[PDB]
Design a protein around this ligand. Sequence first.
Ligand SMILES: O=C(O)CC[C@@H](NC(=O)c1cccc(COc2cccc(/C=C3\SC(=O)NC3=O)c2)c1)C(=O)O
Ligand SMILES: O=S([O-])[O-]
Ligand SMILES: [Cl-]
Length: 434
Amino acid sequence: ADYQGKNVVIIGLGLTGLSCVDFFLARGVTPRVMDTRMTPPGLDKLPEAVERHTGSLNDEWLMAADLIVASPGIALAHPSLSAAADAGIEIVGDIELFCREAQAPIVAITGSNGKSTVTTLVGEMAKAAGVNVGVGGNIGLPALMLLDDECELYVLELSSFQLETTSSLQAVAATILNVTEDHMDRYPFGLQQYRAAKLRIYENAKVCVVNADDALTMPIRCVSFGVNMGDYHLNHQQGETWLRVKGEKVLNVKEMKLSGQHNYTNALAALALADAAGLPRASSLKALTTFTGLPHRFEVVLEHNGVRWINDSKATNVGSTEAALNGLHVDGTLHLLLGGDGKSADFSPLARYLNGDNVRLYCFGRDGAQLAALRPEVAEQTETMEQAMRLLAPRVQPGDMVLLSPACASLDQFKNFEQRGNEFARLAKELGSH
Ligand SMILES: O=C(O)CC[C@@H](NC(=O)c1cccc(COc2cccc(/C=C3\SC(=O)NC3=O)c2)c1)C(=O)O
Ligand SMILES: O=S([O-])[O-]
Ligand SMILES: [Cl-]
């Protein structure tokens, strides 16, 4: 693409907005930036020469633009954007800009849960093969910060939002790992509208990798992964699990540092993508044995005095919390922290995990009351996570687990789920020893 001479408007500041500003400036185009937030992140990192408008969208700038580059954080359905679209003004996002420039194959990964783990794993598989790989997107670096002529493979985590504004992705291998209710505040046509955004990832993909156990991952000729069925699947052997490809054992999961069924299916999905991307199977298996997991993903931050304190702050939806609780072994009592901005999700699916004598709920943030209602008799509600932690800590006994898996976004009270996880870990360390 050639942007020279164009009037470009970027919506949204932050690292990704900034990567877009830098992209255009390095191409001799000075964009203008707007953000509906009165005081957006990275405003101070914006070069003085770049005009900016904050606290609202500026329709004068939008309607004057030749190209609008929309952050995944602004809805396409916003009246100002739909006005511009009606006028025939082109709207893209950062991922679209990246796809138009990239000079190496792209592995593209989306899904309601598992996408950062799978993205990171495939990156590690590439590194193990000695491939120069750029890994990022919706995690790590914004994708435009990865662009480099020496890169031989890109591995991108993509959100449903990023996919809505992308039209030129031709992935070497693409997956939707699963589709469970999330972001309903952004999808007023519900689950199928959210799914449709993710289904975009398969358009013009050379290989599609689908989840044999989740029909919503299938296009409306794909490689599949699954538990009991699929091209890539698991083979259980007397309290032993193997990864298999078409009947052939490829890895006994005792060699993995990750544990749990959903991590085994993440490993299958990663291997399927890596195979389709032409990475040697041997090095890809090696990467599976060395990968330790991501911060905030069911992460043990303290195991002391008979209590495990687990930071699963990356559980920002119900399906993710369900994955933490399903099959969970606890010797004593589970003290479960739930809370934040539930994005209008139905929390009901969690209730089946919350029966019996050995569960307590501590519920906080915007939707704390709705969360406590899952089982009022074992629930406490506080305003903040810190209040909840200080409430539960006196009650913790040897054998117990304290689990932050909040089923909600952190954004009502925190900068992001990492800040929430970091605060939890600090408080766990304070409260979890003498
Ligand atoms: O970290 C958490 O706790 C939750 C993360 C959680 N993320 C989002 O909902 C999300 C969806 C799309 C994009 C992003 C990245 O986050 C951004 C980046 C730039 C601007 C904005 C907000 C903008 S831009 C504007 O013009 N007006 C705004 O309010 C938000 C975040 C979620 O999954 O629930
Ligand atoms: O720019 S991103 O980090 O919101
Ligand atoms: Cl506005």
